[PDB]
């Protein structure tokens, strides 16, 4: 798809592409706004239509060009044109510098028609109820945005919910020994792979002690 050369509306006064329209106060507010949206189309007959900004208009038998402040007005006019069997209309966003961005028929095929090369953006692979609970994701990446969680996080919190209901079989986290641990950070033994072995043996000692203590009055 080739973007056209839509000029800035303040530099294209009196263009032959402009349809005959009455002109109202509803048009884009100059002297305060510099971002304009332009919609172009090619018609077959001078059929009267309604401008999104109040007032009616008559197309041209050839090319047409209109400028609007908002993309919504351009899309409304596009739907109105498409109701009149007028395809091949393109909607551009004009930056303040004059950069032309091609917006509505982005890949050249209207969004209601399946086109190859598209990928489901903002897709979630479950029913809407499958979203994780907001309470589970507190102070994580998804603090108040449980609907933004990746499906792996949703499954992880679901498994956590499943686990944290069998209370008797849970493992209480041992209380840290603050007074005798906690040396200066430079005082470490390195041996990271040995540190997990130390984790294993210390947790084994904790579990054995807990079992021995429980097997006294239970």
């Amino acid at each position: 798809v080739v973007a056209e050369a839509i000029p800035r509306p303040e530099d294209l006064l009196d263009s032959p592409k402009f349809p005959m329209f009455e002109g109202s106060t509803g048009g884009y507010m100059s002297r305060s706004t510099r971002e304009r949206h332009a919609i172009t189309w090619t018609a077959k007959g001078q059929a009267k239509f309604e401008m999104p900004t109040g007032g009616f208009a008559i197309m041209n038998q050839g090319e047409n060009l209109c400028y609007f402040r908002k993309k919504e007005q351009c899309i409304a006019l596009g739907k109105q044109l498409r109701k009149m069997k007028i395809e091949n209309y393109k909607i551009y966003r004009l930056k303040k510098d004059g950069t032309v961005i091609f917006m509505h028929p982005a890949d050249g095929v209207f969004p209601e028609k399946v086109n190859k090369g598209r990928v489901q953006v903002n897709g979630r692979p479950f029913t809407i109820r499958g979203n994780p609970q907001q309470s589970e994701l507190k102070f994580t990446k998804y603090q108040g945005k449980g609907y933004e969680a990746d499906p792996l996080t949703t499954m992880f919190v679901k498994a956590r919910v499943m686990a944290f209901a069998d209370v008797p079989n849970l493992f209480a986290l041992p209380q840290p020994n603050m007074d005798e641990l906690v040396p200066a950070e430079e005082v470490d033994k390195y041996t990271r792979q040995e540190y997990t072995t130390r984790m294993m043996e210390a947790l084994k000692r904790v579990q054995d002690d807990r079992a021995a203590k429980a097997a006294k009055s239970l």
Partner: protein, 79 residues
């Protein structure tokens, strides 16, 4: 005073006013000194609450922190 309401007029309820001053200017100034102290301390507290905790202080601030010996006990006593 011009009273309003039925009960004040039909019971003769009156509002006495002391002919003296109440508090002398010196006492009011003494109260205003401590009010200014409260005001300065409250502005400082508002600043601290607005900025919040700075965790990156351990990279620049001197000292090495401190956990009081009871706070350690409260840590390891449970939750």
């Amino acid at each position: 005073r011009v009273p309003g309401g039925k009960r004040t007029q039909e019971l003769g309820l009156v509002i006495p006013m002391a002919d003296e001053d109440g508090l002398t200017d010196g006492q009011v100034a003494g109260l205003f000194v401590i009010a200014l102290v409260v005001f300065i301390s409250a502005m400082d507290l508002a600043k601290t609450m607005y900025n919040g905790i700075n965790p990156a202080k351990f990279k620049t601030s001197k000292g090495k922190g401190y956990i009081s010996p009871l706070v350690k006990r409260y840590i390891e006593n449970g939750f």
